[PDB]
Scaffold this active site. Structure first.
Site, PDB file in Angstrom:
ATOM      1  N   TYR A 105       9.309   2.349  13.356  1.00 58.64           N
ATOM      2  CA  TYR A 105       8.587   1.219  12.791  1.00 58.64           C
ATOM      3  C   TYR A 105       9.060   0.911  11.376  1.00 58.64           C
ATOM      4  O   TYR A 105       9.570   1.784  10.658  1.00 58.64           O
ATOM      5  CB  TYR A 105       7.056   1.444  12.795  1.00 58.64           C
ATOM      6  CG  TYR A 105       6.567   2.440  11.776  1.00 58.64           C
ATOM      7  CD1 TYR A 105       6.486   3.779  12.099  1.00 58.64           C
ATOM      8  CD2 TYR A 105       6.234   2.044  10.479  1.00 58.64           C
ATOM      9  CE1 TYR A 105       6.032   4.712  11.183  1.00 58.64           C
ATOM     10  CE2 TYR A 105       5.783   2.958   9.539  1.00 58.64           C
ATOM     11  CZ  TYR A 105       5.710   4.305   9.903  1.00 58.64           C
ATOM     12  OH  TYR A 105       5.299   5.255   9.020  1.00 58.64           O
ATOM     13  N   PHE A 115       6.944  -1.630   2.769  1.00 54.52           N
ATOM     14  CA  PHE A 115       6.113  -0.499   2.312  1.00 54.52           C
ATOM     15  C   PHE A 115       6.411   0.815   3.006  1.00 54.52           C
ATOM     16  O   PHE A 115       6.087   1.885   2.447  1.00 54.52           O
ATOM     17  CB  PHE A 115       4.612  -0.805   2.330  1.00 54.52           C
ATOM     18  CG  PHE A 115       4.033  -1.089   3.671  1.00 54.52           C
ATOM     19  CD1 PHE A 115       3.657  -0.056   4.531  1.00 54.52           C
ATOM     20  CD2 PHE A 115       3.794  -2.398   4.078  1.00 54.52           C
ATOM     21  CE1 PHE A 115       3.090  -0.353   5.753  1.00 54.52           C
ATOM     22  CE2 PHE A 115       3.220  -2.695   5.313  1.00 54.52           C
ATOM     23  CZ  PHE A 115       2.879  -1.642   6.160  1.00 54.52           C
ATOM     24  N   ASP A 116       7.056   0.775   4.173  1.00 55.49           N
ATOM     25  CA  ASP A 116       7.412   2.003   4.895  1.00 55.49           C
ATOM     26  C   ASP A 116       8.382   1.692   5.999  1.00 55.49           C
ATOM     27  O   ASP A 116       8.403   0.565   6.521  1.00 55.49           O
ATOM     28  CB  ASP A 116       6.138   2.658   5.486  1.00 55.49           C
ATOM     29  CG  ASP A 116       6.316   4.132   5.864  1.00 55.49           C
ATOM     30  OD1 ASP A 116       7.385   4.724   5.595  1.00 55.49           O
ATOM     31  OD2 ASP A 116       5.344   4.689   6.428  1.00 55.49           O
ATOM     32  N   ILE A 135      -4.426   2.766  12.913  1.00 55.36           N
ATOM     33  CA  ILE A 135      -5.189   1.547  12.687  1.00 55.36           C
ATOM     34  C   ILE A 135      -5.385   0.747  13.984  1.00 55.36           C
ATOM     35  O   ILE A 135      -4.594   0.798  14.909  1.00 55.36           O
ATOM     36  CB  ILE A 135      -4.545   0.667  11.586  1.00 55.36           C
ATOM     37  CG1 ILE A 135      -3.083   0.319  11.909  1.00 55.36           C
ATOM     38  CG2 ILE A 135      -4.712   1.327  10.196  1.00 55.36           C
ATOM     39  CD1 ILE A 135      -2.483  -0.667  10.916  1.00 55.36           C
ATOM     40  N   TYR A 161      -6.522  -1.926   7.090  1.00 62.07           N
ATOM     41  CA  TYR A 161      -7.228  -1.104   6.120  1.00 62.07           C
ATOM     42  C   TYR A 161      -8.294  -1.845   5.352  1.00 62.07           C
ATOM     43  O   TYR A 161      -8.871  -1.321   4.385  1.00 62.07           O
ATOM     44  CB  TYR A 161      -6.219  -0.472   5.154  1.00 62.07           C
ATOM     45  CG  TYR A 161      -5.181   0.403   5.834  1.00 62.07           C
ATOM     46  CD1 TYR A 161      -5.484   1.678   6.246  1.00 62.07           C
ATOM     47  CD2 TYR A 161      -3.902  -0.098   6.072  1.00 62.07           C
ATOM     48  CE1 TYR A 161      -4.549   2.460   6.870  1.00 62.07           C
ATOM     49  CE2 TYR A 161      -2.953   0.676   6.713  1.00 62.07           C
ATOM     50  CZ  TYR A 161      -3.285   1.956   7.096  1.00 62.07           C
ATOM     51  OH  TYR A 161      -2.376   2.787   7.735  1.00 62.07           O
ATOM     52  N   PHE A 178       4.295  -5.285  11.025  1.00 66.29           N
ATOM     53  CA  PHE A 178       5.073  -4.143  11.477  1.00 66.29           C
ATOM     54  C   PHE A 178       6.025  -4.589  12.557  1.00 66.29           C
ATOM     55  O   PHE A 178       5.647  -5.315  13.476  1.00 66.29           O
ATOM     56  CB  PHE A 178       4.194  -3.071  12.079  1.00 66.29           C
ATOM     57  CG  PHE A 178       3.372  -2.301  11.098  1.00 66.29           C
ATOM     58  CD1 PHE A 178       2.082  -2.716  10.781  1.00 66.29           C
ATOM     59  CD2 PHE A 178       3.814  -1.087  10.601  1.00 66.29           C
ATOM     60  CE1 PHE A 178       1.282  -1.957   9.948  1.00 66.29           C
ATOM     61  CE2 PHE A 178       2.997  -0.307   9.787  1.00 66.29           C
ATOM     62  CZ  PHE A 178       1.731  -0.756   9.475  1.00 66.29           C
TER      63      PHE A 178
HETATM   64  C1  LIG Z   1      -3.755  14.058   8.448  1.00 64.40           C
HETATM   65  C2  LIG Z   1      -3.264  12.988   7.885  1.00 64.40           C
HETATM   66  C3  LIG Z   1      -1.788  12.776   7.719  1.00 64.40           C
HETATM   67  C4  LIG Z   1      -1.207  11.815   8.778  1.00 64.40           C
HETATM   68  C5  LIG Z   1       0.187  11.328   8.433  1.00 64.40           C
HETATM   69  C6  LIG Z   1       1.200  11.156   9.304  1.00 64.40           C
HETATM   70  C7  LIG Z   1       1.078  11.522  10.758  1.00 64.40           C
HETATM   71  C8  LIG Z   1       2.529  10.627   8.845  1.00 64.40           C
HETATM   72  C9  LIG Z   1       2.685   9.149   9.261  1.00 64.40           C
HETATM   73  C10 LIG Z   1       4.128   8.787   9.543  1.00 64.40           C
HETATM   74  C11 LIG Z   1       2.010   8.236   8.227  1.00 64.40           C
HETATM   75  C12 LIG Z   1       2.910   7.799   7.075  1.00 64.40           C
HETATM   76  O1  LIG Z   1       3.236   8.946   6.268  1.00 64.40           O
HETATM   77  C13 LIG Z   1       4.547   8.770   5.719  1.00 64.40           C
HETATM   78  C14 LIG Z   1       2.274   6.713   6.187  1.00 64.40           C
HETATM   79  O2  LIG Z   1       2.254   5.546   6.990  1.00 64.40           O
HETATM   80  C15 LIG Z   1       1.982   4.330   6.245  1.00 64.40           C
HETATM   81  O3  LIG Z   1       3.003   4.132   5.246  1.00 64.40           O
HETATM   82  C16 LIG Z   1       2.090   3.265   7.348  1.00 64.40           C
HETATM   83  O4  LIG Z   1       3.130   2.639   7.527  1.00 64.40           O
HETATM   84  C17 LIG Z   1       0.971   2.945   8.242  1.00 64.40           C
HETATM   85  O5  LIG Z   1       0.158   2.108   7.846  1.00 64.40           O
HETATM   86  N1  LIG Z   1       0.893   3.510   9.448  1.00 64.40           N
HETATM   87  C18 LIG Z   1       1.848   4.527   9.959  1.00 64.40           C
HETATM   88  C19 LIG Z   1       2.385   4.131  11.324  1.00 64.40           C
HETATM   89  C20 LIG Z   1       1.249   3.837  12.273  1.00 64.40           C
HETATM   90  C21 LIG Z   1       0.403   2.699  11.716  1.00 64.40           C
HETATM   91  C22 LIG Z   1      -0.170   3.078  10.357  1.00 64.40           C
HETATM   92  C23 LIG Z   1      -1.273   4.052  10.537  1.00 64.40           C
HETATM   93  O6  LIG Z   1      -2.211   3.839  11.281  1.00 64.40           O
HETATM   94  O7  LIG Z   1      -1.194   5.289   9.844  1.00 64.40           O
HETATM   95  C24 LIG Z   1      -2.286   6.189  10.091  1.00 64.40           C
HETATM   96  C25 LIG Z   1      -3.275   6.039   8.992  1.00 64.40           C
HETATM   97  C26 LIG Z   1      -2.774   6.091   7.575  1.00 64.40           C
HETATM   98  C27 LIG Z   1      -4.579   5.893   9.339  1.00 64.40           C
HETATM   99  C28 LIG Z   1      -5.702   5.733   8.335  1.00 64.40           C
HETATM  100  C29 LIG Z   1      -6.438   7.062   8.234  1.00 64.40           C
HETATM  101  C30 LIG Z   1      -7.710   6.946   7.413  1.00 64.40           C
HETATM  102  C31 LIG Z   1      -8.638   5.844   7.878  1.00 64.40           C
HETATM  103  O8  LIG Z   1      -9.731   5.748   6.944  1.00 64.40           O
HETATM  104  C32 LIG Z   1      -7.919   4.521   7.985  1.00 64.40           C
HETATM  105  O9  LIG Z   1      -8.845   3.572   8.549  1.00 64.40           O
HETATM  106  C33 LIG Z   1      -8.447   2.205   8.407  1.00 64.40           C
HETATM  107  C34 LIG Z   1      -6.688   4.682   8.867  1.00 64.40           C
HETATM  108  C35 LIG Z   1      -1.721   7.604  10.145  1.00 64.40           C
HETATM  109  C36 LIG Z   1      -0.580   7.716  11.159  1.00 64.40           C
HETATM  110  C37 LIG Z   1      -2.821   8.634  10.362  1.00 64.40           C
HETATM  111  O10 LIG Z   1      -3.424   8.404  11.638  1.00 64.40           O
HETATM  112  C38 LIG Z   1      -2.297  10.067  10.344  1.00 64.40           C
HETATM  113  C39 LIG Z   1      -2.023  10.562   8.944  1.00 64.40           C
HETATM  114  O11 LIG Z   1      -2.427   9.936   7.971  1.00 64.40           O
HETATM  115  C40 LIG Z   1       0.609   4.401   5.579  1.00 64.40           C
HETATM  116  C41 LIG Z   1       0.331   3.191   4.689  1.00 64.40           C
HETATM  117  C42 LIG Z   1       0.493   5.724   4.789  1.00 64.40           C
HETATM  118  C43 LIG Z   1       0.871   6.924   5.645  1.00 64.40           C
HETATM  119  O12 LIG Z   1       0.869   8.088   4.816  1.00 64.40           O
HETATM  120  C44 LIG Z   1      -0.359   8.837   4.853  1.00 64.40           C
END
Ligand SMILES: C=CC[C@@H]1/C=C(\C)C[C@H](C)C[C@H](OC)[C@H]2O[C@@](O)(C(=O)C(=O)N3CCCC[C@H]3C(=O)O[C@H](/C(C)=C/[C@@H]3CC[C@@H](O)[C@H](OC)C3)[C@H](C)[C@@H](O)CC1=O)[C@H](C)C[C@@H]2OC
Length: 185
Positions: A105, A115-116, A135, A161, A178
């Site tokens: 992605y 951003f990523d 998300i 978010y 994305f």
């Molecule tokens: C245990 C935790 C560590 C665990 C980390 C990983 C597996 C590494 C994984 C490659 C994430 C990336 O790490 C480099 C990085 O990806 C971003 O850059 C991004 O592109 C993004 O948006 N993504 C990632 C790809 C899927 C869609 C989305 C997401 O859904 O991500 C999910 C997300 C952040 C959900 C939040 C969680 C909190 C709620 O409150 C909120 O509710 C609205 C939703 C991720 C996958 C979480 O499920 C799991 C985690 O967080 C974020 C901008 C910041 C994030 O870094 C943290």
């Protein structure tokens, strides 16, 4: 005076290419393609052997890069407000809730910033689809994809978010774009 900058928009981001007005547009196409096709200028297909001079281009004119399937694509708005566009269809059984999917992605903001990208860590991202492990826009939007498919999700803030943001750089109330490539199920 002899050089021109051209803005190339592909539906995800904007990337600029500066070339001499007598350089064939092939150089721009190749450079774009190498980064990761049909290029249009005022709705007309650019041929590789044409120059900016031939086409009477001016500085910062826009070129549309079409990376989608031959025949074109459509942007679907669902009942939730999610938008998605299948750039490439792929082939295979469609991704269903409960399957663990592996993707690459890239994500961009409305201001154009990237951003990523999982390609920048050279590291596929895998998750259980339909589990609330991502998300809302991803749980909805990756469903239906097939292996080899590339789908572009335009995710409204309520499916992202919201007012919180994330990751430092995703601000409150942000729409997210994305590109998702489905590698495996
Ligand atoms: C245990 C935790 C560590 C665990 C980390 C990983 C597996 C590494 C994984 C490659 C994430 C990336 O790490 C480099 C990085 O990806 C971003 O850059 C991004 O592109 C993004 O948006 N993504 C990632 C790809 C899927 C869609 C989305 C997401 O859904 O991500 C999910 C997300 C952040 C959900 C939040 C969680 C909190 C709620 O409150 C909120 O509710 C609205 C939703 C991720 C996958 C979480 O499920 C799991 C985690 O967080 C974020 C901008 C910041 C994030 O870094 C943290």
């Amino acid at each position: 005076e002899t050089h021109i900058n051209l803005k190339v928009s592909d539906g995800s981001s904007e990337i600029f290419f500066k070339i001499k007005k007598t350089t064939p547009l092939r150089r721009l196409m190749e450079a774009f393609a190498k980064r990761q096709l049909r290029f249009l200028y005022d709705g007309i297909r650019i041929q590789a052997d044409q120059t900016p001079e031939d086409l009477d281009m001016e500085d910062n004119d826009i070129i549309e890069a079409h990376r989608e399937q031959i025949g074109g694509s459509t942007i679907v708005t669902t009942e939730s407000g999610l938008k998605y566009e299948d750039l490439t269809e792929g082939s295979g059984a469609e991704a269903r809730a409960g399957q663990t999917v592996s993707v690459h992605y890239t994500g961009w903001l409305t201001d154009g910033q990237k951003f990523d990208s999982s390609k920048d860590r050279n590291d596929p991202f895998a998750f259980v689809l339909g589990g609330g492990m991502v998300i809302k826009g991803w749980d909805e939007g990756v469903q239906g994809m097939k292996v080899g498919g590339v789908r572009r999700l335009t995710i409204p803030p309520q499916l992202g978010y919201g007012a919180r943001g994330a990751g430092g750089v995703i601000p409150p109330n942000a729409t997210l774009v994305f590109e998702v490539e489905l590698l495996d199920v």
